[PDB]
Amino acid sequence: LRNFCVFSSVKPLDFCDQYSSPCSSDATVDDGWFVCEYHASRFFKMEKLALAIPDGTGNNYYRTVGKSLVDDKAEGIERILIPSQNNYETVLNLSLLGPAERLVFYMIYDNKEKQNEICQQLRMYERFRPEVVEELYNSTLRVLALTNPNESRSFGLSVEDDLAFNVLPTFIQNLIRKCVAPESLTIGTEDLQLRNCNTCRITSEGLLASVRLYNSVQPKYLYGVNENRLQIRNVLQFQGNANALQQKLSRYELYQINIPLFLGKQIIST
Amino acid sequence: LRNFCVFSSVKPLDFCDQYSSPCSSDATVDDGWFVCEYHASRFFKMEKLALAIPDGTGNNYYRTVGKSLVDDKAEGIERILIPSQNNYETVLNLSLLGPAERLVFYMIYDNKEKQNEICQQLRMYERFRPEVVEELYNSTLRVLALTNPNESRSFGLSVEDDLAFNVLPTFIQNLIRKCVAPESLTIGTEDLQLRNCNTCRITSEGLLASVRLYNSVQPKYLYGVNENRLQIRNVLQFQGNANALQQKLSRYELYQINIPLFLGKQIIST
Amino acid sequence: LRNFCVFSSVKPLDFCDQYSSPCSSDATVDDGWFVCEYHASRFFKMEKLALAIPDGTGNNYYRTVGKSLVDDKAEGIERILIPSQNNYETVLNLSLLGPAERLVFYMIYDNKEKQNEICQQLRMYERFRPEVVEELYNSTLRVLALTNPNESRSFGLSVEDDLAFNVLPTFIQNLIRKCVAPESLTIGTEDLQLRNCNTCRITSEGLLASVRLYNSVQPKYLYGVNENRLQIRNVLQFQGNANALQQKLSRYELYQINIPLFLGKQIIST
């Protein structure tokens, strides 16, 4: 598979003489997410980060961790990172999306009736090109197949967290497992406390950025804005020169104020 | 006999259009083991070494000695070099091996009932090629025939060692005699003390590497390892440059730290 | 997939410098059996036949049907074509087969505990080549994946036949569906009565050649026989010249006396 993104198979059904998928350059690497950084940012509101664990000899074990794009001012469903099967249609706005993306989302969340309804309603597009549904269905199925199943992963000390996790679809479970790093990682015979505090939570509505931590990240795929419209809203600004703002302190190494997803514990077998 | 290995006659019963035996290049020399170095390493966990005894004129008498591949960390049946008829099935894992190798091992250890059972159960393979059992049985029998019987060989000062040796099958007895060198060899009229200490033992469970000597040998047929799997285990390493590790001392002739099999005494008649 | 046979991935674990799979020339065609004719004949005791249904314009729809190799003199388990999960180990003689074929059969019949036991017992072969289990497991899994799911198929008028069919593994169900032709096929709007009588049956022990029809087929993969052994058994022969035997009647087109597998009804949707 040259492109591992599950949304890479989405194409204009009407006419595709020359179309390029919007997947980013990371869609060609098998990091286990099966979602490119562009699509993850667009849908699940997160980016990818690499976490390196050293051993003592000079070898590094690498892991993926999600970086939350949710600001501290977001409220309600705006703080939901990955929606669950109970509210994915409302959170992702499936009615507004195109039929191909809607079918892909239905197949991801395992809605057989919706899958059949969309497939039967999409047959009239066969009159344009004879692979409107066949190749899309096959590609999505072969992408989802790779997600099917002494390392252990716990997502909280409470039973309700485990119940919320085990009711999610297999693709969503794999995405959450790959995007959420453990607070404490037991590797070999030693425990590494990556973080003593959590930043995300798993509930009946999916994976949410429950903690309202301050986020100062600049998205590299969601930075578009309409300059033609006039926006009138109060903000706060600083008065002073470099002495008052202490601009010289910028010469030091900057501490990034971001929100990586940390929750639960992980056991890595020998 | 171009190939003296007892396991050289093992072939895929189903289809053998182009099959090459895994016997090493030493299978064509009649050293008396009747087992190639590859098969000896695979089953009995030992390699072959040459021992030269000079006379005084310029002629050398050559003998074979087994080199143990068992590390000092092995425990229990992992330290068994050559299993006896009491526990050969468990040690060699006959239930996991193929029917041809299982039949060869049964014939080596003289289990007539197992031989007949395997031969009668292997008749259904005659429908592929008409020599599934006939040629294998004939080759194994003609190999075993060569092992049938004032030089003397003692394998310990205790009676129980002799009792353990004399209850072994003829093929196993010949293999042990050829692979185990004497601690003291009485040749002509003089005694040569090859080693004042023993490295192997013969008991009711066969020939074992009882002494937990340090082994630093690298097997040349058992070096395969799966690099795809991640292995997490503590080891010890040395810190320092060539001065701390004394790498310059490597210019001297190296003393090999291996475990040749030495036990008992041998009398060679004129 | 260049080779669709599920047993094509079986290789000698010890050494495979130059090994050729015994799969026949039909292993490269995707007929839906996922078992080559050689392996089907060896294990399930059947061959492949093509059945052509014309339409009226000049187009033929092709289907596969199993040809039974069981003679009318066979008794008991010798008449079992495809064993079920209740007695597959005894019928196929798994204890006599090699570890790779045994693992493949375990994975086909969905025996997770046996799969894990064989995989853990086969780790010691990693010391020869690092893909003793990994590539075999991956190939068998990707072959089995293709078998996972208004056309309908009924395998008898009794409820017990349906109960026997629905308890079989998915691979076995697909093989039975592909190898057993319907007695009556409802295609489009018309019924074609291919045969008014059945030749095979499905029970709690799998697919069996229940009807003791006379079989005069000569297997093209199971014709081996040991000419060196003397066989003494009474048979019947015909006395007479060409006039008594009516050899001249051989000039007419011969009616083949074989036993294709016919059972149930099939509905093919538009």
| DSSP conformation letters of chain C | -----TTTT---SS--SS------GGGGS--S--S-HHHHHHHT-EEEEEEEEE-SSS-EEEEEEEEE---TT--GGGGEEEE-TTTHHHHHTTTTS-HHHHHHHHHHTT-HHHHHHHHHHTGGGGGT-TTSSHHHHHHHHHHHHTT----EEE--SSHHHHHHHHTS-HHHHHHHHHH-B-SEEEETTEEEES-SS---EEETTEEE--S--------SSS----SSS------------HHHHTGGGGGSPPPP---B-B-SEEEE--
Contact yes or no for B98 and C95 at CB 8 A: no
Contact yes or no for A188 and B230 at CB 8 A: no
Nearest to C130 among B21, B134, B226 (CB): B226
Instruction: Give the three-class secondary structure for B20.
Output: coil
Contact yes or no for B19 and C14 at CB 8 A: no
Tokens of C198: 């059945």
Q: Is A150 on the interface with B (CB under 8 A)?
A: no
Q: Is B224 on the interface with C (CB under 8 A)?
A: yes
Distances (CA, A) of A135 to A126, A141, B86, B107, C102: 12, 10, 62, 58, 36
Contact list in B for residue A54 (CB cut-off 8 A) is: none
Instruction: Give the three-class secondary structure for A226.
Output: coil
Contact list in B for residue C96 (CB cut-off 8 A) is: 99, 121-122
Taking CA atoms, what residue in B is nearest to A187? B232
Q: What is the DSSP letter of A50?
A: E
Q: What is the DSSP letter of B74?
A: -
Distance of alpha carbon B159 from alpha carbon C62, whole angstroms = 78
Dihedrals phi, psi of A191, to nearest 5 degrees: -100, 130
Chain A closest CA to B245's CA: distance in Å?
17
C24: Cβ–Cβ under 8 A, 6 or more apart, which residues? Answer: C36, C37, C38, C221
Contact yes or no for B237 and A188 at CB 8 A: no
Cα–Cα nearest to C67, from C194, C184, C181: C181
Distance of alpha carbon C206 from alpha carbon C213, whole angstroms = 19
Q: What is the DSSP letter of A112?
A: H
Contact list in B for residue C8 (CB cut-off 8 A) is: none
| Consecutive H or E run containing A67 | strand A60-68
Contact yes or no for B232 and A57 at CB 8 A: no
Distance of alpha carbon B69 from alpha carbon B261, whole angstroms = 11
Contact list in B for residue C69 (CB cut-off 8 A) is: none
Resolution of this structure in Å: 2.8
Distance of alpha carbon C196 from alpha carbon C184, whole angstroms = 8
Q: Is B134 on the interface with C (CB under 8 A)?
A: yes
CB count within 10 Å of CB B136 equals 21
Angle at CA of residue C165, ends C164 and C169, nearest 5°: 110
A17: Cβ–Cβ under 8 A, 6 or more apart, which residues? Answer: none
Instruction: Give the three-class secondary structure for A266.
Output: strand
DSSP string, A72-107: TT--GGGGEEEE-TTTHHHHHTTTTS-HHHHHHHHH
Give the neighbor-by-neighbor strand order of the sheet with A184-187.
A152-154, A265-268, A184-187, A190-193
Distance of alpha carbon A40 from alpha carbon A22, whole angstroms = 12
Chain C closest CA to B12's CA: distance in Å?
8
One-letter amino acid identity for A181? A
Distances (CA, A) of A198 to A52, A195, A261: 19, 7, 8
Task: Tell me how the structure was determined.
Answer: cryo-EM
Taking CA atoms, what residue in C is nearest to B132? C226
Q: How many residues does chain C have?
A: 270
Instruction: State the virtual CA torsion across C7, C9, C10, C16 in degrees, nearest 10.
Output: 150
Distance of alpha carbon C46 from alpha carbon C64, whole angstroms = 12
Contact yes or no for C226 and B126 at CB 8 A: yes
Mutate to test the interface with C, among B90, B96, B133, B134 (most CBs of C within 10 A): B96
Q: Is B231 on the interface with A (CB under 8 A)?
A: yes
C111: Cβ–Cβ under 8 A, 6 or more apart, which residues? Answer: C85
Chains that touch B (3 or more CB pairs under 8 A): A, C
CB count within 10 Å of CB B174 equals 19
Contact yes or no for B233 and A57 at CB 8 A: no
Distance of alpha carbon B48 from alpha carbon B67, whole angstroms = 6
Q: Is C138 on the interface with B (CB under 8 A)?
A: no
Instruction: Give the three-class secondary structure for A119.
Output: helix
Instruction: Give the three-class secondary structure for A38.
Output: helix
The most distant pair of C-alpha atoms in chain C lies apart, rounded to whole Å, by 69
| Consecutive H or E run containing A178 | helix A170-179
Cα–Cα nearest to B194, from B69, B72, B70, B63: B63
Distance of alpha carbon B32 from alpha carbon B147, whole angstroms = 8
Cα–Cα nearest to B89, from B65, B111, B119, B59: B111
Distance of alpha carbon A116 from alpha carbon B191, whole angstroms = 91
Taking CA atoms, what residue in B is nearest to C12? B12
Chain C closest CA to B225's CA: distance in Å?
5
Distance of alpha carbon B28 from alpha carbon B163, whole angstroms = 34
Q: Is B20 on the interface with A (CB under 8 A)?
A: no
What is the CB-side half-sphere exposure of residue A11 using CA atoms within 13 A?
21
Contact list in A for residue B237 (CB cut-off 8 A) is: 57
Contact list in B for residue C221 (CB cut-off 8 A) is: 128
Contact yes or no for B237 and A57 at CB 8 A: yes
Distance of alpha carbon B146 from alpha carbon C180, whole angstroms = 55
Tokens of B51: 């021992």
Instruction: Give the three-class secondary structure for B269.
Output: coil
Tokens of C34: 């996922």
